[PDB]
Design an enzyme around this catalytic site. Sequence first.
Site, PDB file in Angstrom:
ATOM      1  N   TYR A  39       3.116   4.713   0.603  1.00  0.00           N
ATOM      2  CA  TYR A  39       3.551   5.338   1.613  1.00  0.00           C
ATOM      3  C   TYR A  39       2.790   6.207   2.713  1.00  0.00           C
ATOM      4  O   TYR A  39       1.825   6.805   1.932  1.00  0.00           O
ATOM      5  CB  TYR A  39       4.776   6.199   1.137  1.00  0.00           C
ATOM      6  N   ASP A  96       0.963  -1.250   0.090  1.00  0.00           N
ATOM      7  CA  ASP A  96      -0.124   0.041   0.114  1.00  0.00           C
ATOM      8  C   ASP A  96       0.966   1.247  -0.024  1.00  0.00           C
ATOM      9  O   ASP A  96       2.291   1.037   0.115  1.00  0.00           O
ATOM     10  CB  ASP A  96      -1.076  -0.101   1.056  1.00  0.00           C
ATOM     11  N   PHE A 104       6.358   2.746  -4.457  1.00  0.00           N
ATOM     12  CA  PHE A 104       7.830   2.818  -3.952  1.00  0.00           C
ATOM     13  C   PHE A 104       8.280   4.234  -4.373  1.00  0.00           C
ATOM     14  O   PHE A 104       9.396   4.682  -3.651  1.00  0.00           O
ATOM     15  CB  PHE A 104       8.573   1.788  -4.220  1.00  0.00           C
ATOM     16  N   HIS A 163       9.684  -7.858   1.875  1.00  0.00           N
ATOM     17  CA  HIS A 163       9.554  -6.513   1.589  1.00  0.00           C
ATOM     18  C   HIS A 163      10.925  -5.515   1.777  1.00  0.00           C
ATOM     19  O   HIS A 163      11.292  -5.959   2.946  1.00  0.00           O
ATOM     20  CB  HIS A 163       8.442  -5.893   2.421  1.00  0.00           C
TER      21      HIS A 163
HETATM   22  O1  LIG Z   1       4.177   2.267  -2.736  1.00  0.00           O
HETATM   23  C1  LIG Z   1       4.741   1.709  -1.326  1.00  0.00           C
HETATM   24  N1  LIG Z   1       5.596   2.593  -0.813  1.00  0.00           N
HETATM   25  C2  LIG Z   1       5.766   1.876   0.530  1.00  0.00           C
HETATM   26  C3  LIG Z   1       5.716   0.429   0.523  1.00  0.00           C
HETATM   27  F1  LIG Z   1       6.304  -0.061   1.704  1.00  0.00           F
HETATM   28  C4  LIG Z   1       4.909  -0.369  -0.103  1.00  0.00           C
HETATM   29  O2  LIG Z   1       4.492  -1.440  -0.159  1.00  0.00           O
HETATM   30  N2  LIG Z   1       4.527   0.521  -1.419  1.00  0.00           N
END
Ligand SMILES: O=c1[nH]cc(F)c(=O)[nH]1
Length: 225
Positions: free
Chosen positions: A68, A66, A79, A189
């Site tokens: 930030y 999901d 990310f 992750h």
């Molecule tokens: O877009 C995202 N930012 C940070 C995350 F840790 C992730 O899973 N996705």
Amino acid sequence: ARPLSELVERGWAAALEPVADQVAHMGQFLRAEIAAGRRYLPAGSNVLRAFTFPFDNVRVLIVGQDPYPTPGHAVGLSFSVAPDVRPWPRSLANIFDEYTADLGYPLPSNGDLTPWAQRGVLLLNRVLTVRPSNPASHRGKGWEAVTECAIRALAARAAPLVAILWGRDASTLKPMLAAGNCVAIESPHPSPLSASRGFFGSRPFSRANELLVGMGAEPIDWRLP
Ligand SMILES: O=c1[nH]cc(F)c(=O)[nH]1
Ligand SMILES: [Cl-]
């Protein structure tokens, strides 16, 4: 306040047709969140940003959990941050450490992953919104059907695809992707908590290219400025 075709790129609008209803529902959920005084990230106009690059050129999908949770970071590409954001989120710092280790390219100048999105990488999250400071707060609220539909659509094309699945929620997609044209790479992750478990050393960029080349597809140009 637009229908699918206006929110996403033409190919994606066709791909996401089955979930047009669900997207509308999610717009109603987000409206209700604002009415209740709760915030969400990223900005409304960025929620579907990952689908604003051509569905046809997608060759790799990177999937996270999901967005930030810090306001000013999430921009609708998993990310990624805006090119003027620093310090980078720690997950991204870890991603870039693995980038340099894997590919040998210089550390990027900024955190904007737009080049990857423009080159055939879908920068997806399993859930497309979050309340601020509240990671995973919109898990189970209706996005999963939308992102599932996206993945299944990609996997149904007569084209090679590689998925890079970062973390537990992304890992749920693995069985969906598994016909013979699709190959999924999974790792822990890149966040600090989980990265020691096997993100570092995972060489996802070079592995995804080896896989693409082995299926007859062009590799991704991963280079960032
Ligand atoms: O877009 C995202 N930012 C940070 C995350 F840790 C992730 O899973 N996705
Ligand atoms: Cl809030």
